[PDB]
Design a protein around this ligand. Structure first.
Ligand code: ZN
Ligand code: ZN
Lengths: 98, 370, 549, 463, 109
């Protein structure tokens, strides 16, 4: 949504903070953002990727080729950008960086 | 907001419209943590030149004196919004004026702490307490043994804001008030300020002790000046600086011209002989080259015969003959001065030539016959 | 020192003892009591011990006495009247109907002058009052023969109506008034006659006056009410108490303050002004006091002593004339009933627990600090309670503000400004695909165009109606209803959903179809059946919004 | 306390009664009675009178059992009783009842002579009615009858007991059950039988029509309110072992509930905010009365005869309001203290008075709003049932309503407080027309809709 | 109808008198001194200036400019010009015996 073309105010997903089942359970019964990273050779990335799209040397075509599946990648192509926040299927917001 | 669609809510939030053609509203309206009831009706057109309005008697009590103002505002104001704004303003004003009536402490902060600090200071100390507990007073000695009292007015919050202090001695006393600052803190500051001026007190002590001090009679501690009789039918008047009480004062005399001059020149010639090391009396006796009457007549010092209006004698030849029919005032007055007084007075009333009205000093019936 | 002393306590049920029915009096040093049951009790006023106890049947309902005769009266409920020797040659006593008289058995009220007797009775639809005689000599206890009766032409039927006796000067358990007030209220006649007057207050609330020296009627001469009885003014709630009181206090104390006293708390009071017209004028008032009012009395110097279910309370009148508002404090004694007020003020009353008691009104070092300690602890006790009130009050105000916005919204919608601007809602026709098929959907959009924030309490409904017709055959899904909790819309913000209109049973879809929006509001959520509803929009989906290409 | 030398205490109409056996040498022990009152001069207690009752037999194991004010039937007058066990040690016991007069003189009203020994779930009621039970055998004896009698219904325990208007004497041992004593055997608006598992003591408030307003408390250290059987307003307790409760008024709306414990401690909790306001410990005994002469009632707390071999020492009294008592000038300030206190109480009172106006205006605005939008019964009634997992709701209607001229619907809505999230609710609408005895004439036209149920059973409940 | 009371008409007698004195032309200045002389002579030596300043500062309404416009003024500006100036002149001289807290707000005016 942060990179959304239309800039729509589609409201936040606000995934369920409980199951129906566990709500029922308790209701009868009476922080650091985790992070991870990897690295890889610029040469490996070029020689694998290259197919020169245009080529903003690295991190950008890296992100495109990582998200060639997710249909909102031709938008990152117009807005070549090495870090964004997508949301999820199942709630919480996530950032990535390249 | 600019348009009265949000503004009326923001500014009359606990007042609600009952009707669709929005003419009849009702409900509460807030000020100073207190809410007051109103029931208001307009005509079908939303003009205020005729608009019905009632309140609570709680409210009309508090708007005693401005009912006319309100009735006039109802005609003058074009918008109800403007009208209610003026109303809130007026309301806050009349509250602050009658603020003696309205007082709600945070007691456990207030009373408990106050008492603990007083127990800390000492039960010997306290002199007085108001039932509101807004006002109190306290005492200090000097090592001389001079008693000096202070009075304290307290706001809603004692530690939050600084209490107002009123003390006998003249200089503009000040003291640091933190929220950490307490009764004992300000008391220690007052104690320092006492001995800061100890000389000036010893000065005034010797003056009033030995001498025919004239009219700071039974003086206070703020009394800077001293009028002293000397010889007969002549009086010096003097004023001191307490930062340098031993210093020369500013001084001069009143009385008869011929008796005045020679002492004037004695002073003019012996002034360089000032010694701010011995008694000021010691300086005075040998600068003016004289000794003084120690209460030459303690009884009949001066039953003053001045106007009391213009504080003068011989007003265009006239004597302040007109007096008070009172044992406690007895004050002479001039015909014309007392006239122009009681004329401008609203309470007065004119007979054919005789007029009656209140004595300026004591407010008792006094009669003037032109 | 102890301003209150308890003498005795009684059998009492839950809730409490009955409003009005119990009554208690004291002669000089004797006390006579009715617990609004069959029983009556008599005790010494010095010693709380008992002297006598009287078993009647048929709940006691009213009492009177006459000191000169050493008798008591009583009104058993469904029977009529009884009367008792106070000398009266366990200490319980029963009664036999040897003592009883005139058991008319339908009558409710009675009063007493010195040697005359007056009664009010429920008949059918029109009640009626009767005047009886009372044997003045040392007689066998009699009425004698009654003298004249009238129909209460007005009243058309727990709460007993009440009677009060009103005499002018020169001539009683009643209340003597002043000549100015007679000439004000009762007219030239009763003044000319020095006629006693009787006021009757009715469970209706209305209130009527009557003249004895005009009320004598017979079998050849009936009691036409249309003149003989008259009405003051309809106190529109039932009647509890009538008095008469002394203002300007500068036994036979001539009053000038008329006092009427309702249940819900309409007090009414009247006085003479005789001003601004060169003639006699009445000063009226119609007060509004607190709570359901139980019991009343009269203390020396315009001091009414009354009870509300919270507490025991008071109103002084002693002085425009007397009083604009009815300000009122307590005395810090509970909600009571059955009060009696004597002068020295001292008084006697009964507590809803069923307890008898007597109200009597008006330095040490190192215990000083204990006194101060107690004071501080007490204030600390009060403080939290005050704070709780404050917090609750905050909540109430918040609710009010919410409400005001809601009202603003509603009015904004209902008045059309070339369009229901502040809220709008659209719907659009959008195809889709599902498991195999080209399904039709309908997007619904909601927009806030104003500043009015729609918040907790609101909720939205839509209802889809798959036809514009009514059938012989009772189709099986006439329409569908989607409802959603709108929550914190905000201004300039927006919600959206999307709906399956489309065919779900046997390939069925027909067109004119319409989709109808609404909002609701829930006065009850924010803390006859209560809620309201707002149309907001209407859109019709037809063939020309579903064609693919 | 019960022994040949121990004593028991009681409160009565602004004073206090001590009932103590004294081994009178010649004699077997004699009951000796003190009637005492609070001073308010020295803030102590004083003997105002005494009485006594001589005893005849040479049998020890005389024993006080209980005491209260009971409202005799022959009079209708509150009066102090005492119950005595008289154990001849023959495995035979008299079980006397006495009641005492204004005269400080006694009067027996039941001998009653049991062979076996009661401990008991013992209690006492209006006509001097003893009520007891040894093993699952509930009995009562009046002073009228003077004979042993049993109760019809069999119970576990008989917690509450007392007269009620239009009924005479009633009891409550099973919340299902609702007895009389005259004609043994209303069970209609009694609590949740779910709560029947937990409640151990009850104290009722008031009665209407059937309906009541009632109070309870569980083994869970709770305190509950009920009106029409509606579980509103629960609190929670510091301590455990809830023995029993009483009430106090303490002036206008300053009401309180006063709970003892078998742990020898207690709580006082305020009304309009179900909440502990104060708590006390070790509590030798407790009593509730206007001991002063102020108008309203107060409470007394007794601490631990560990102190002395003397009862009436070690005391405290408090309204929890302007009253508090117990066992270098400084005087310039007392008047301001009292002034601030009383102004504070005044503002308290006026805040209640003001709060009510707030709520009144709220309701005024409700009705005003509902009128702002704008008679006949276009409905008869609602009904509904479950099927298996598909709730259905429906409506019987009238001739006022004609479906040929108006398309109609029936929505549902949820009260968001229970289910506090976004989610949708969908309901399917069905006309149903029927004919009644064709073989004008009646045509029935009902309207109803269906939806799902397991999605909503989230908080075990909803509305 | 076309009469008003004194705006000081509601006050402590000494201070109200003092105002009625300062009203009186230029010389009213020195009459101010005479008042204080007379009162330090009189039984009430302690003249609470603190009291006085509060009343000076305290606000009250007026309807001036057009007929349809309210505003507020403290006592100090609504009272007549000559009394203002005379008063100010006296204050200069008694400046030692005055409290800063009130003086400051007075000066803000
Ligand atoms: Zn003059
Ligand atoms: Zn004078």
């Amino acid at each position: 949504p942060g990179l959304a073309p239309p800039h729509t105010r589609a409201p936040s997903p606000l995934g369920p903070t409980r199951d129906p089942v566990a709500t029922f359970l308790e209701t009868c019964r009476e922080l650091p953002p985790s992070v991870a990273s990897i690295k890889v050779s610029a040469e490996l990335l070029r020689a694998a990727l290259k197919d020169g799209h245009s080529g903003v040397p690295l991190c950008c075509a890296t992100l495109q080729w990582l998200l060639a599946e997710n249909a909102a990648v031709d938008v990152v192509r117009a807005r070549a950008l090495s870090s964004i926040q997508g949301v999820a299927p199942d709630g919480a917001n996530v950032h990535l960086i390249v | 907001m600019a348009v009265t669609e949000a503004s009326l809510l923001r500014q009359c939030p606990l007042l609600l419209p009952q009707n669709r053609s929005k003419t009849v509203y009702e409900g509460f309206i807030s000020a100073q943590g207190r809410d007051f009831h109103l029931r208001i009706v307009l005509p079908e057109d939303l003009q205020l030149k005729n608009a019905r309005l009632l309140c609570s008697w709680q409210l009309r009590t508090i708007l005693s004196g401005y009912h006319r103002i309100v009735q006039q505002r109802m005609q003058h104001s074009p918008d109800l919004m403007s009208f209610m704004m003026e109303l809130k303003m007026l309301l806050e004003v009349a509250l602050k004026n009658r603020q003696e009536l309205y007082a709600l402490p945070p007691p456990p902060q207030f009373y408990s702490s106050l008492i603990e600090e007083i127990g800390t200071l000492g039960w010997d100390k306290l002199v007085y307490a108001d039932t509101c507990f807004s006002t109190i007073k306290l005492k200090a000695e000097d090592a001389s043994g001079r008693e000096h009292l202070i009075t304290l007015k307290l706001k809603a919050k004692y530690p939050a804001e600084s209490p107002d202090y009123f003390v006998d001695f003249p200089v503009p006393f000040c003291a640091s008030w933190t929220p950490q600052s307490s009764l004992i803190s300000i008391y220690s500051q007052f104690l320092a300020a006492i001995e800061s001026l100890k000389a000036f007190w010893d000065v005034m002590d010797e003056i009033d002790e030995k001498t025919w001090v004239l009219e700071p009679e039974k003086p206070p501690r703020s009394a800077t000046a001293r009028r002293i009789a000397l010889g007969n039918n002549v009086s010096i008047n003097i004023e001191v600086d307490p930062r340098h009480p031993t210093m020369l004062p500013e001084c001069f005399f009143l009385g008869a011209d011929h008796v005045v001059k020679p002492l004037g020149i004695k002073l003019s010639r012996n002034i360089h002989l000032w010694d701010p090391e011995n008694s000021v009396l010691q300086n005075l006796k040998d600068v003016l080259e004289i000794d003084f009457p120690a209460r030459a007549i303690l009884e009949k010092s001066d039953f003053t015969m001045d106007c009391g209006i213009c504080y003068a004698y011989q007003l265009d030849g006239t004597i302040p003959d007109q007096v008070c029919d009172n044992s406690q005032c007895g004050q002479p007055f001039h015909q014309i001065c007392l006239y122009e007084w009681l004329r401008g007075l609203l309470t007065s009333r004119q007979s054919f030539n005789i007029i009656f009205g209140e004595c300026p000093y004591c407010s008792k019936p006094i009669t003037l016959k032109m | 020192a102890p301003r209150v002393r308890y003498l005795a306590g009684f059998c009492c049920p839950l809730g409490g003892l009955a409003a009005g029915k119990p009554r208690v009096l004291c002669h000089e040093a004797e006390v006579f009591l009715s617990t609004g049951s069959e029983l009556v009790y008599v005790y010494d006023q010095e010693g709380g011990l008992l002297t006598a106890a009287f078993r009647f049947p048929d709940q006691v309902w009213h009492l009177e006495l006459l000191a000169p005769r050493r008798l008591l009266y009583a009104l058993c409920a469904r029977r009529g009247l009884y009367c008792l020797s106070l000398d009266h040659p366990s200490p319980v006593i029963p009664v036999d109907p040897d003592a009883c008289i005139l058991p008319d058995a339908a009558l409710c009220a009675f009063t007493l002058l010195d040697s005359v007797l007056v009664t009010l009775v429920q008949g059918p639809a029109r009640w009626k009052m009767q005047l009886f005689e009372q044997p003045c000599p040392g007689e066998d206890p009699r009425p004698g023969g009654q003298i004249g009766e009238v129909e209460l032409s007005s009243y058309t039927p727990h709460f007993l109506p009440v009677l009060c006796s009103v005499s002018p000067s020169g001539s009683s358990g009643g209340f003597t008034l002043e000549d100015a007030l007679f000439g004000l209220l009762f007219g030239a006649d009763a003044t000319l006659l020095q006629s006693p007057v009787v006021l009757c207050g009715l469970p209706d609330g209305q209130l009527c006056c009557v003249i004895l020296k005009a009320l004598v009627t017979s079998r050849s001469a009936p009691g036409d009410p249309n003149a003989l009885v008259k009405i003051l003014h309809h106190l529109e709630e039932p009647v509890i108490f009538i008095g008469a009181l002394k203002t300007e206090p500068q036994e036979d104390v001539h009053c000038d303050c008329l006092v009427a006293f309702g249940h819900h708390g309409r007090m009414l009071a009247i006085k003479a002004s005789w001003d601004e017209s060169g003639k006699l004028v009445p000063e009226l008032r119609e007060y509004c006091l607190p709570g359901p009012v139980l019991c009343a009395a009269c203390g020396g110097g315009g001091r009414v002593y009354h009870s509300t279910p919270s507490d025991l309370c008071v109103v002084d009148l002693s002085r425009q004339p007397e009083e604009g508002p009815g300000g009122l404090p307590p005395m810090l004694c509970p909600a009571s009933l059955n009060i009696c007020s004597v002068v020295s003020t001292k008084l006697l009353a009964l507590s809803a627990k069923g307890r008898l008691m007597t109200c009597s009104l008006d330095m040490t070092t190192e215990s000083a600090g204990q006194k101060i300690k107690e004071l501080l602890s007490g204030i600390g006790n009060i403080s939290e309670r005050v704070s709780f009130l404050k917090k609750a009050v905050d909540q109430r105000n918040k609710a009010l503000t919410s409400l005001n916005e809601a009202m603003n919204v509603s009015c904004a919608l209902l008045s059309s400004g070339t369009g229901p601007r502040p809220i709008s809602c659209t719907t659009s026709t959008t195809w889709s695909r599902l498991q195999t098929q080209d399904v039709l959907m309908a997007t619904c959009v909601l927009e806030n165009s104003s500043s009015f924030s729609l918040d907790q309490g609101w909720t939205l409904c839509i209802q889809v109606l798959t036809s514009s017709c009514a059938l012989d055959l009772d189709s099986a899904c006439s329409a569908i209803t989607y409802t959603i909790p709108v929550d914190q819309l905000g201004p300039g913000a927006r919600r959206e959903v999307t709906l399956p209109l489309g065919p779900g049973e046997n390939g069925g879809l027909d067109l004119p179809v319409t989709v109808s929006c609404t909002l609701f509001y829930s006065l009850r959520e924010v803390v006859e059946q209560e809620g309201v509803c707002l149309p907001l929009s209407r859109h019709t989906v037809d063939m020309l919004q579903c064609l693919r290409f | 306390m019960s022994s040949n030398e121990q004593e028991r205490l009681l409160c009565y109409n602004g004073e206090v009664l001590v009932f103590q056996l004294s081994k009178g040498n010649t004699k077997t022990p004699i009951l000796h009675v003190r009637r005492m009152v609070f001073d308010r001069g020295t803030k102590v207690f004083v003997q105002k009178s005494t009485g006594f009752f001589t005893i005849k037999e040479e049998n020890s194991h005389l024993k006080i059992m209980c005491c209260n004010c009971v409202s005799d039937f022959r009079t209708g007058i509150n009066l102090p009783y005492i119950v005595i066990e008289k154990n001849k040690k023959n495995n035979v016991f008299e079980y006397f009842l006495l009641i005492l007069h204004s005269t400080n003189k006694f009067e027996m009203r039941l001998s009653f002579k049991l062979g076996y020994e009661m401990k008991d779930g013992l209690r006492v009621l209006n006509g001097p009615l003893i009520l007891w039970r040894h093993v699952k055998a509930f009995f009562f004896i009046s002073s009228q009858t003077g004979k042993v009698v049993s109760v019809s219904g069999n119970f576990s325990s008989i917690q509450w007991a007392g007269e009620i208007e239009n009924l005479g004497m009633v009891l409550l041992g099973l919340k299902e059950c609702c007895l009389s004593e005259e004609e043994c055997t209303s069970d209609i608006y009694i609590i949740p039988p779910a709560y029947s598992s937990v409640v151990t003591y009850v104290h009722i408030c008031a009665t209407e029509i059937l309906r009541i307003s009632l109070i309870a408390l569980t083994r869970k250290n709770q305190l509950i309110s009920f009106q029409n059987g509606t579980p509103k307003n629960v609190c929670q307790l510091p301590f455990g072992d809830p023995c029993a409760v009483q009430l106090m008024d303490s002036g206008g709306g300053n009401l309180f509930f006063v709970v003892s414990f078998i742990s020898n401690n207690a709580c006082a909790v305020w009304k309009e905010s179900f909440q502990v306001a104060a708590k006390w410990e070790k509590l030798s005994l407790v009593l509730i009365d206007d001991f002063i002469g102020s108008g309203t009632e107060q409470v007394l707390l007794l601490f631990k005869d560990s102190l002395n071999s003397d009862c009436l020492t070690s005391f405290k009294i408090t309204d929890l309001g302007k009253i508090n008592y117990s066992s270098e000038n400084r005087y310039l300030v007392v008047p301001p203290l009292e002034t601030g206190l009383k102004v504070c109480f005044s503002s308290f009172r006026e805040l209640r008075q003001h709060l009510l106006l707030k709520e009144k205006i709220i309701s005024k605005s409700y009705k005003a709003l509902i009128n702002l939008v704008q008679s006949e019964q276009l409905v008869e009634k609602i009904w509904y049932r479950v099927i298996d997992d598909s709730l259905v709701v429906g409506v019987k209607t009238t001739s006022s309503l004609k479906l040929s001229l108006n398309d109609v619907t029936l929505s549902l809505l949820m009260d968001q407080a229970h289910d506090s999230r976004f989610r949708l609710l969908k309901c399917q609408n069905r006309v149903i027309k029927l004919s009644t005895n064709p073989f004008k004439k009646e045509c029935v036209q009902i309207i109803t809709a269906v939806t799902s149920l397991s999605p909503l059973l989230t908080f075990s409940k909803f509305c | 109808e076309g009469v008003e009371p004194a705006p000081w008409a509601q006050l402590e007698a000494p201070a109200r008198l003092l105002l009625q004195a300062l009203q009186a032309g230029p010389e009213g200045a020195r009459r101010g001194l005479g008042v204080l002389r007379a009162l330090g002579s009189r039984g009430w030596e302690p003249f609470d200036w603190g009291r006085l300043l509060e009343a000076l500062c305290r606000e009250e309404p007026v309807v001036q400019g057009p007929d349809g416009r309210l505003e507020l003024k403290p006592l100090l500006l609504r009272l007549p010009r000559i009394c203002q100036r005379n008063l100010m002149s006296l204050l200069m001289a008694v400046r030692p015996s005055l409290p800063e807290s009130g003086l400051l707000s007075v000066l803000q005016i």
